Amino acid sequence: GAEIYNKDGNKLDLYGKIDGLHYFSDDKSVDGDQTYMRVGVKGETQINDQLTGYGQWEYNVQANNTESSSDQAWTRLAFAGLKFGDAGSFDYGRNYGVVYDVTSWTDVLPEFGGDGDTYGSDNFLQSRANGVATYRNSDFFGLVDGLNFALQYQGKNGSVSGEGATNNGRGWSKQNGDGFGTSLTYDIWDGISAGFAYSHSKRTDEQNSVPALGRGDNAETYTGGLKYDANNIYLASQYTQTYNATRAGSLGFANKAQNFEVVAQYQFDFGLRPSVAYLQSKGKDLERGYGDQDILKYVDVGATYYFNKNMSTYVDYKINLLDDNSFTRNAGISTDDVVALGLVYQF
Amino acid sequence: GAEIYNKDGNKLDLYGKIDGLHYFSDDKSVDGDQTYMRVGVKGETQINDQLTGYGQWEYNVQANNTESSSDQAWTRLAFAGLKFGDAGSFDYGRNYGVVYDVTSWTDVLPEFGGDGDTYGSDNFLQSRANGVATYRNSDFFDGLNFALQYQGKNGSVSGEGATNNGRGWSKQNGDGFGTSLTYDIWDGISAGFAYSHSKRTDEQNSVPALGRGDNAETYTGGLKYDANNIYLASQYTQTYNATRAGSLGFANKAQNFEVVAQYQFDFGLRPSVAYLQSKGKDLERGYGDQDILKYVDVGATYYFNKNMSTYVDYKINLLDDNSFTRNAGISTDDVVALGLVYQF
Amino acid sequence: GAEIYNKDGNKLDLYGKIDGLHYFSDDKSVDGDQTYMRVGVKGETQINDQLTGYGQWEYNVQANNTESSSDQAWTRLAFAGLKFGDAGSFDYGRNYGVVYDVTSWTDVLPEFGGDGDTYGSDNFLQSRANGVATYRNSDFFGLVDGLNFALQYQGKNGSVSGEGATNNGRGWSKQNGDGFGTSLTYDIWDGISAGFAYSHSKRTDEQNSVPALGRGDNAETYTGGLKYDANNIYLASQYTQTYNATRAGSLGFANKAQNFEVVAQYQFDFGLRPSVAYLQSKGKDLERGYGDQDILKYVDVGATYYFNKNMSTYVDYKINLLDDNSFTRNAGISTDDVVALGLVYQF
């Protein structure tokens, strides 16, 4: 929270956290210090009785490498928008894709989970993305309480140079063409919710030529999710079928993929919040003889102790169930277990 | 604005904007998402009845690329200074060159214009620069503002012409100075003049193919009308070895001209029309006289209030594609910009 | 200072400085504009009567290069911690090594001194380091007033690739293995203090193979310091003996080294604060025929004028006493004088 300005209908919210974090793992690419911090600003201005303008900015700053290292900070979110009361809201910039409106229900683990597992950042509309225009409608205007739907469009994010280039070029793993997404969530009963999400994007020419894995003109995602959040109990499950949209590590994309996440949590009155979860990502029809491969598969057990709204500490144990093989080695998929210890100050 | 601290005579101002921006162009180096944000801090402390100290920092953060991209943020401004009441002020750090005291009068377009057009950043004293010492005097000890500015050498990465903060030839400079003078002859009518003289580095005279000379010079004159919901501003600058000729180097001499007309409606709409051109002369490699920049700008901005706005800007590029534009990398396509800005 | 939030027992402090700085030197790697700024956040939350949580973040942003330059900003500090009253405190993240608890007594020069001289940043536990767990006890609980001790542990910070790698790899100069440190300072009077510091770390494989200078499995530092700070007079001395821990420029580490810093200052009532100091770093038993070599040696004279608590200006003159030879030339150690002019706004 930490509202630092609230004068003349203009509110400024300064949020962020400092996370002293350490990983223990046989994977040397993962083991070691993981300390980082986040800094953010939420701003809001009242234009008239029916119109409110807003903007948000979220910045990730790593603190686990030296003062001469490179690329230690990056923007997670940055968008400006207008809210027209019950009509809805629209914003554009770097924001979360609507697919995350459902898959975030399982992104509640102490440390692991979320982007970088079954889905990644800058991975079409599955997570945070560049240049997304998002329309959101709350409670179906004034009709149905708990019914939310969103419509989203994303412009092409092409290559660095060449015919498929845009001003903000990237590598094939983080490219996209013109695409759209839609999400729909409803609370059938108190504490129980169901959600659906769909996204369809054009694939770029470099995605079909540079990597060895993944061929197709369109990336598609079908997502369904459930949530129970009542009586100090949190239960969430999420199943997604992707087409030419799930990353197969360094090697490319999977032609088809089935991702599944499920998590169970309980919140004690004195602050402890133990958590158990299972995540898997099944790839199908891979090129170069890989065929059907496990991209992700692990069981997560951990807990978080909340001192208050500004301080917490946690332990997270990722029990990796992947078997080391040619695919995991060539794609760069980690198969070792990791234990995470964190102490977080939030503001 | 958004002053967040004001206790015991010390004020701290937190300003900035978040700009959801998108470009439409046949030029692939320009087309696509352009979302960025800026965050800044203005600080002021009162030392005594006649002395006030201050510092400012302005930071640009791009938001149009991935979380693994590189060089997405940079400092636009960072300087500390002392104010001697009405007598004037002195400050040092990364600040605008005094040439911008006049050329900023035309830097009022919805999206385009300013640095990156007839002049650039780190381009001698034309815009934001490193290591500038600036003295400013108000009402000339009335209504007449004068500035004297000095900039230390900003050399190469290594070699004889190196400094601790080395750069490439396009953004290098030697020891230089500038001076500016603006006056309001009538209510709402202003005239300005600016001069700049800098030593050029050896790499600027050896590495690029275009531009040869020991000194960079700038002569600028400007007019501005700002009254009755009407804004009119014009600016003419003649440079010598100071206007960039794209990737190829500098123009030996160049004539830049900017003019803009705007109207502010009471309900928030602000349409804008402008014309910009950059004529390079006496270029090497057989180029001779070349158009570096030439376009007509039309657009408008709607201000919801002091914290929220939306704008569209259309750059009608009048440059003809030829050997010079292709080799220098100068865009000749049109650009359309759509933006939604939150300010704090 | 500049506390911007203080509500419901949660305080947020926003600090920093803007330093308009210029160096004059025959050394082209040092001469020119050195303008930079610092921004920091100090946060504190009260959990209960006996427990307080906190976090701090410090960010360095250079302003002396262009808007197209690279790696102009980096994190100096980022850690989260808990205070259990008189029992002590613990924090983890990027923080100062306990050796600096003593050597900071001489880090009081107008511009020079500190990191980059006898010791550097990311240099085992001598200065700011990644992934340090620090326990600190003040006044020996409540029993011995003015007696402070600290115990510190640092995990391995290995290479970018290979067997000795961690997730946050660096080059050999800023690598470390598992290490620990301890510090002890006592205030005999309110202005007279004595301090001791010890540090022991395992060395990485790249530190013994890539550089030409410095061989050994363990890095050690022994530090003792004296300080007088009363009656507008500041006197401080610090002597450190290192083993395979002092950097010998580009060539590697010194097998053993003796560092000495001494500084004398006086504070006038009208704001002027003249300063004189001497710093030296004597290397011993260097390979390739270097033997005993001077790594650092200069006399510092300067002054700082404080306008108030938020504005200051200073001049600092480094009179370099190093003679140019084969070692200084090959290691890249500057032997020229430097004059610094600074104007600082603080918030």
UniProtKB/TrEMBL annotation, chains A, C:
<dbReference type="GO" id="GO:0015288">
    <property type="term" value="F:porin activity"/>
</dbReference>
<keyword id="KW-0812">Transmembrane</keyword>
<keyword id="KW-0998">Cell outer membrane</keyword>
<protein>
    <submittedName>
        <fullName>OmpK36</fullName>
    </submittedName>
</protein>
<keyword id="KW-0732">Signal</keyword>
<dbReference type="GO" id="GO:0046930">
    <property type="term" value="C:pore complex"/>
</dbReference>
<keyword id="KW-1134">Transmembrane beta strand</keyword>
<dbReference type="GO" id="GO:0009279">
    <property type="term" value="C:cell outer membrane"/>
</dbReference>
<comment type="subunit">
    <text>Homotrimer.</text>
</comment>
<keyword id="KW-0406">Ion transport</keyword>
<dbReference type="InterPro" id="IPR050298">
    <property type="entry name" value="Gram-neg_bact_OMP"/>
</dbReference>
<keyword id="KW-0626">Porin</keyword>
<dbReference type="InterPro" id="IPR023614">
    <property type="entry name" value="Porin_dom_sf"/>
</dbReference>
<comment type="similarity">
    <text>Belongs to the Gram-negative porin family.</text>
</comment>
<keyword id="KW-0813">Transport</keyword>
<dbReference type="GO" id="GO:0034220">
    <property type="term" value="P:monoatomic ion transmembrane transport"/>
</dbReference>
<dbReference type="Pfam" id="PF00267">
    <property type="entry name" value="Porin_1"/>
</dbReference>
<keyword id="KW-0472">Membrane</keyword>
<dbReference type="InterPro" id="IPR001897">
    <property type="entry name" value="Porin_gammaproteobac"/>
</dbReference>
<dbReference type="InterPro" id="IPR001702">
    <property type="entry name" value="Porin_Gram-ve"/>
</dbReference>
<dbReference type="InterPro" id="IPR013793">
    <property type="entry name" value="Porin_Gram-ve_CS"/>
</dbReference>
